[PDB]
Amino acid sequence: NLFVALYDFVASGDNTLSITKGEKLRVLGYNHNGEWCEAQTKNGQGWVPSNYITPVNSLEKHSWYHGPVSRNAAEYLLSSGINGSFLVRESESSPGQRSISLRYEGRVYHYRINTASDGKLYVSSESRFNTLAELVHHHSTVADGLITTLHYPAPKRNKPTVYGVSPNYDKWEMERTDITMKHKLGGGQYGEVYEGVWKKYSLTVAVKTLKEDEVEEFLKEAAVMKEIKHPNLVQLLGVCTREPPFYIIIEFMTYGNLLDYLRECNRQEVNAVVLLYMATQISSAMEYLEKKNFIHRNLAARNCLVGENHLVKVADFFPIKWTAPESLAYNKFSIKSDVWAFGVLLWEIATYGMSPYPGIDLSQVYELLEKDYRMERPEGCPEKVYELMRACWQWNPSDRPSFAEIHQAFETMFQESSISDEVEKELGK
Numbered sequence: 001n002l003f004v005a006l007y008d009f010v011a012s013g014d015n016t017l018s019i020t021k022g023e024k025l026r027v028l029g030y031n032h033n034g035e036w037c038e039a040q041t042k043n044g045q046g047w048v049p050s051n052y053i054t055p056v057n058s059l060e061k062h063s064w065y066h067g068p069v070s071r072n073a074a075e076y077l078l079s080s081g082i083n084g085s086f087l088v089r090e091s092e093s094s095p096g097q098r099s100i101s102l103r104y105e106g107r108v109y110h111y112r113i114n115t116a117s118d119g120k121l122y123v124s125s126e127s128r129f130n131t132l133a134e135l136v137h138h139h140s141t142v143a144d145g146l147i148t149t150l151h152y153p154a155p156k157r158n159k160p161t162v163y164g165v166s167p168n169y170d171k172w173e174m175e176r177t178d179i180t181m182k183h184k185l186g187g188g189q190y191g192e193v194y195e196g197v198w199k200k201y202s203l204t205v206a207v208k209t210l211k212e213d214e215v216e217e218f219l220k221e222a223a224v225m226k227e228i229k230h231p232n233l234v235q236l237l238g239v240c241t242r243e244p245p246f247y248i249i250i251e252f253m254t255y256g257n258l259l260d261y262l263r264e265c266n267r268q269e270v271n272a273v274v275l276l277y278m279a280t281q282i283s284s285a286m287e288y289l290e291k292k293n294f295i296h297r298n299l300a301a302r303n304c305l306v307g308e309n310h311l312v313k314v315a316d317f318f319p320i321k322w323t324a325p326e327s328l329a330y331n332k333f334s335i336k337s338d339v340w341a342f343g344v345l346l347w348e349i350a351t352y353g354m355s356p357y358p359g360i361d362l363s364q365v366y367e368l369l370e371k372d373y374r375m376e377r378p379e380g381c382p383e384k385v386y387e388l389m390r391a392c393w394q395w396n397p398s399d400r401p402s403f404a405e406i407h408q409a410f411e412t413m414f415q416e417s418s419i420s421d422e423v424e425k426e427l428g429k
């Protein structure tokens with residue numbers, strides 16, 4: 001059938017098609033993995049990312065329909081809202097289960113959408129509708145059981161994730177001259193990493209360059225990155241590995257590293273909901289690396305990048321404070337030692353980037369960990385979050401939760417409350 005564009009896409013490659021949000025398209029076919037599709041508009045024919053469009057006969061065409069988003073992710077999306085800001089979401093775990101998340105007087109209210117035996121949808125038993133768009137349209141005029149009216153659909157601000165810049169199989173080599181190299185990133189903090197502009201592809205990029213005094217390591221890094229495909233792990237955009245200097249390209253992350261971001265942010269804007277949103281994106285990324293059996297070895301807030309709308313990406317650019325005991329004693333690294341490091345990262349988030357083990361000499365850390373000493377619950381930290389850190393910090397690696405269990409815990413943690421209320425109580429008690 002017919003499709004509608006949900007996001008703007010600017011033609012870059014020769015086989016690509018420029019599209020505007022709201023525009024109709026006919027879909028001719030798909031690329032090797034279904035992530036790109038060949039579409040036809042009134043302006044032409046060409047390749048577009050599949051997730052930038054949706055059938056005209058689908059719920060995703062509505063600005064208020066955010067699809068599979070969690071209770072907590074909905075609270076984040078509405079944190080920038082006003083009274084009447086709202087969205088409709090589906091449960092990822094239990095398909096077909098929908099809810100309304102509505103902002104009123106700085107709080108988010110969640111309502112289950114009920115289905116009758118004849119298939120009619122309702123929030124209030126007296127007001128049943130044949131379709132979801134009719135239910136939404138009704139509660140957009142009268143509250144009729146909701147705290148207030150549904151007036152402002154929450155914006156879908158971040159563009160969907162696209163792995164690379166091409167629909168074609170293993171086309172990663174790009175043209176060096178198409179990038180205008182600017183200054184070194186973060187005032188030389190990351191080494192041979194530069195800010196660049198990729199005009200052809202309409203991107204601001206971060207470019208890692210190879211200079212004399214290891215080619216084999218730089219090539220292995222590009223090769224590893226080709227297989228890392230998750231919305232919260234840095235996505236490789238392309239390489240220049242034919243002639244020197246060798247390039248590795250990713251999209252530039254506006255707000256730099258997470259550690260400095262936590263330390264320098266506006267704490268009124270970056271509240272408990274925003275902090276939980278960032279921790280959950282990191283846990284999703286680590287669940288993905290766990291499935292791939294990939295050992296990160298360097299998980300810390302300093303190794304995470306912050307983009308627009310608090311989009312967090314795990315990357316890999318004193319470290320004793322993040323290191324598991326078996327790794328310190330026997331140089332044994334595993335997914336379970338990444339779990340330990342995640343617990344410390346959670347403590348960095350819970351404190352707005354404080355340095356771990358305050359007042360403790362680095363030479364005494366292992367000895368203290370052995371006697372079952374652990375960092376104290378940060379001030380304002382909800383007990384359930386501190387229990388998770390304590391689970392990550394189990395002496396024995398096999399006693400530690402897996403990243404799939406950590407992610408599941410976050411998504412079922414404040415299922416009948418708000419982390420903002422939990423933090424409020426801990427700051428009071």
Ligand SMILES: Cc1cn(-c2cc(NC(=O)c3ccc(C)c(Nc4nccc(-c5cccnc5)n4)c3)cc(C(F)(F)F)c2)cn1
Binds near residue numbers: 208228233255257317
């Ligand atoms: C052999 C091997 C590779 N890896 C691995 C490499 C990376 N690469 C980068 O993070 C990386 C590579 C190239 C570039 C250009 C960058 N970009 C970068 N680096 C430092 C700072 C910034 C930056 C700073 C401020 C604003 N925006 C970006 N960007 C990252 C990422 C991963 C991970 F975490 F995703 F699993 C794994 C591990 N073992």
Ligand SMILES: O=C(Nc1ccc(OC(F)(F)Cl)cc1)c1cnc(N2CC[C@@H](O)C2)c(-c2ccn[nH]2)c1
Binds near residue numbers: 271276279
């Ligand atoms: O929101 C807070 N914590 C939180 C959020 C999410 C969590 O979950 C996770 F999953 F995101 Cl890690 C876990 C903990 C928070 C609020 N206020 C704080 N203050 C104390 C006095 C005041 O001036 C500033 C602190 C704080 C700063 C330094 N230490 N403590 C933290």
